[model samples]
Target: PQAPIAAYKPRSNEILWDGYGVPHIYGVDAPSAFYGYGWAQARSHGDNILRLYGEARGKGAEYWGPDYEQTTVWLLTNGVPERAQQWYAQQSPDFRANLDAFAAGINAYAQQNPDDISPDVRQVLPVSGADVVAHAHRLMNFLYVASPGRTLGEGDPPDLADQGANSWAVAPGKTANGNALLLQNPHLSWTTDYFTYYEAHLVTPDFEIYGATQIGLPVIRFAFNQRMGITNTVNGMVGATNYRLTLQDGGYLYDGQVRPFERPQASYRLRQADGTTVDKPLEIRSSVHGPVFERADGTAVAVRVAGLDRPGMLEQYFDMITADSFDDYEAALARMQVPTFNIVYADREGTINYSFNGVAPKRAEGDIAFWQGLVPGDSSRYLWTETHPLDDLPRVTNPPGGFVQNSNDPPWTPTWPVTYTPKDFPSYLAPQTPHSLRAQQSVRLMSENDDLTLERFMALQLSHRAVMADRTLPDLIPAALIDPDPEVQAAARLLAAWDREFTSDSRAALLFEEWARLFAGQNFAGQAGFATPWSLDKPVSTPYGVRDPKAAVDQLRTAIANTKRKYGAIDRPFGDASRMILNDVNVPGAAGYGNLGSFRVFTWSDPDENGVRTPVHGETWVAMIEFSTPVRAYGLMSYGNSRQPGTTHYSDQIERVSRADFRELLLRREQVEAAVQERTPFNF
Candidate 1:
């Protein structure tokens, strides 16, 4: 052990344990104990953790085999290697010190156990502490960059896998529980990079803070009840406002203007599978309103946003949740001027909030072609001039309605329609399918009930309610009610009388989803046999065409009828056909449920090993809680923490998740100390 090891020794008194493989490291100050906690993690996962990071950083091929060679090639080809090396060069010397300490622990472990270190890894690995730390950072950068073609192999970068997360706070006034509530369910991939929620009580009578880290990143990615009194909801945000290519003499030149003035270049660097270098130029856009991104290909893209760039916006929002005494975390959202994603928030105020928000640029209201194509000559024609201000965005705040929600639908119809008004900001501002089936269901449920308890809210969120009945029933109901064919008519009647919930018992749920199967894998001429509406206002592959919306619906119905002819009947239960069977386990369901204007847990990844999702998006995390005068929090994860298998944690938490149970989060020492598992000491 190094000289610091003696001073940094951890006592049995400094640790606590949880049933789950979680550790609460206790020490004097944040750094004092955190350093040791990291060592403890090494003690547990140690070499395997490094190996996982190695795989993530594309060095796996060198250590493991050529099978992973492409990962490194992808990194180098996309310029990730060069960028990572450059970032390391620029990182401060202090970061090196931390790595050095971590390295010392590793070295100590290797020295102590010759058998624990894998022979192959030991030979190939660089025996320096910095290299380990640098590899970790490289992994971080890879996760941060977003390119359509890169992240996902097949096409434009796939959306973040819907490892969804939910955070909630309950105000004292609204809760009969009398305590403020909070939920922090973050749905991250079951990968090593996805750090489980680690709790540590570092107090040498000086510093105090608590939250979770997503592993590699050093800082607390999300913090709560800290001195800053702020909670950060971070999703990757980068790129220029717009890259205006002035067809100056035909060949365009990008006029880069950055938003926030400081962030000018929309970073676009690609490292190919073979480490080819490409400095893809990204044009940044800045507007008086907010920022957005326009592709290099001259596609006009901007955050159709309004009323942002305010001071205290994020703080106020967090305050609403933390105070939980009746503050509008939603109203405080005025600062978000940019339209992007569903905002997940929490605060000390015992308030939690969510919003399906985005900033969209405005366009001529009646201009149909504008939606489909770039303007011919004038650049101004393609750009948004003025837009709805902050106050005009759709949001629900402190509504007497007792709940707030978003299932990835437009704000026009979130939960109770009466509580939150839809902003008539320019059409592009809220351009997604305005209302999703999820949103419709949420509204129906909330409106029906005047007061909703936490238990009811949880049930509602887990609901697999299918509203395809409402959209498809009218057409099919008439056909089934008086059809010449008994089978079609009987199926329609079965669907009509069915309650919309999509439990295993529901037959309509299965059949209705089958109707959607018409286009599941169909790509005939890229049309899926259904007539899709052509928007003259949006960009079209080829200009000048009439849309056939009715024709598309008719075609889909015909496909459904054809299914009846082939599959013996049209009304198969949703679970019967769609359920994924894995490890002798059965999870019958659709690959997605809330994409068409509903909560966008939009997942799209190839399945591997078992029929479990190689999911791309949806339900990242969900956590809800009541914060008493002294806020206590509770939450759950979609998958268990450890990405590695065979370890006790490999899938420990999955059991709770599968059954829909949540564990309380011990934020402070009183809560966490008793729950601590491992402890280590460190010095610099």
Candidate 2:
């Protein structure tokens, strides 16, 4: 049996539950507040957090059985527990106290609700501060490093999807209120896993921050404090490298010298078919670079990742939230502890800024291609010991254009031609991938606007206009008109007559969407590498022209015919084909994809028996914040606030988001009290 840590006085700590199931935590100090916040999270999402910690601790196979064996191997081999213990001991006293309080709160909940937690979960009880650190490390590993490696050999160099997001920071000069406006819309999956985001507000004497955090994390990953707001989009930069090693007898050759491999064994408890539990063992190996993975051909590959050897990610985020000004925030960023994200910031002082922030390894002096491609494992020269600091990374603060944004594009084109230019930075700092349709759309929309009000910013963030169609249709219409098939000609006529937008009521979007998908694959396939066709002068349009005119026409006609067959008409409204169905409510929706250059990016799934299309991933946790007095803001978590079905919030926000309806966020004490449905002591 284990004893509890010294308890804080409950008089100073309280948690208020808003009507929308969001928690407002108030405490005299950070640790007690975090403890209250953690308890509230556990009360809301009980077993889910435990499952995440189980995976983080490399006990996935033990908890989930054979299905998670590979995941278990990956976690254990990557040294999650060992790293967690190391990092926890090295963490600052303040951070460690908060972490301990958070974990203790969860354990308190488990102790109170004995029936709520299962036997398997109880076996892994007494969740510690180290477990929280492990969770952060696991998330960093997935997002910045090993996501592609998990699916390696699926495609040459791996077909990594551009993890999507759109952030905007409008300076005082551009906003109607003479205050900066910010749009934080991150594109992430809506599921019950660790990717699920939870909204909360933490208030102490020194800090009052409101934002969204991943399920298992302790601090806000993206949010706004009393004086300023900060959020990040996934910047698709290379933070990890894969090295193909020459496998030898019990080791690999490095600089013509054979280095012995470190072999370690891991064990997992699996539930057998007969319902008996058995301990299964796995052998894991590693090289100097990192973990060693064996391919089907018996060749070994090593992955070199940034920040795996380091920790204290939550500490930096804690510092970021407490920061009152741009200088304070930048100082926190200078730590460069968080592995990835392209940060966009705005403040009440009228400052708007953007930084392509990450701890990217400083590669040896060589060609860009050489650094991007496989590094010679035989030389110690390929190993990078230093990283470009926050000041050295690409950043734009108060640009002449008065706005900044990143749609997973290079920092040089943050707001198109008005931003950083490639000549100013090394090629390794910015990879030459094609600027996405969404990136072009973001540039076009923001550049065309001058006086952006909160309302105007909200409208723009939700706009479904496809910039790709605007650029490509001019060239495509003429080519299609020349085709021999009437079907192809009619498809061309429909596209030419169409308003290039993704509005729910738009009839032509579906036809264009299908046609463009096929066209891009056929056109860009076999092109020498992934160099994008975008140029500074033609930033809104490039990657130009069709590959095979006849082939493109055929695809257009085929898509039209298929839509007609499936939906009974090719001219159905975009919303009718793509929609959200919650309980009994059917709401029309707009889908943005890479093909159409839509900033309102949404990826759709196959329709149900009723021909209702559902969005699997796209926009979630969207917030429009204006730095006006008291901070005017409207926000929505698209998946609502609960995975538990009996709760009122389960699908409530889903329906609300489909109609573009956002509940006004109440930050002030008066506003919170006005909307408060329940108030309770934290009890941790």
Q: Top model by TM-score, which number? A: 2
lDDT of each: 0.42, 0.75
Error of 1 at 601 (Å): 6.7
What is the Cα-based lDDT of residue 109 in candidate 2? 74
* lDDT by residue for model 1 (1-684), tens: 101111222333243445565555555443444454455455445555566556545455555555445455444333443444444454445444444544554555555555666564554333343344344434333333232232222332222333333333333455555433444434444333434433323333433434554553333334444321222232222211223233334233333322232134433334345645344444444333222333445443332222222222223333333332224434444545332445544444434455544333345652322442223322344445454444554544544544454433344544343454424444444443334344455555544543345675455456554444444455545644554556555666676878766554565654554444443222111223222332322211111121333443444467556545543446655444444332334544442455221222323243333322333344434454443434444445444333333456544554454455768766555555566564433442
Output the number of the lDDT-best candidate: 2
- Residue 344 lDDT (model 1): 47
> What's each prediction's TM-score?
0.61, 0.92
Residue 343 of model 2, lDDT score: 89
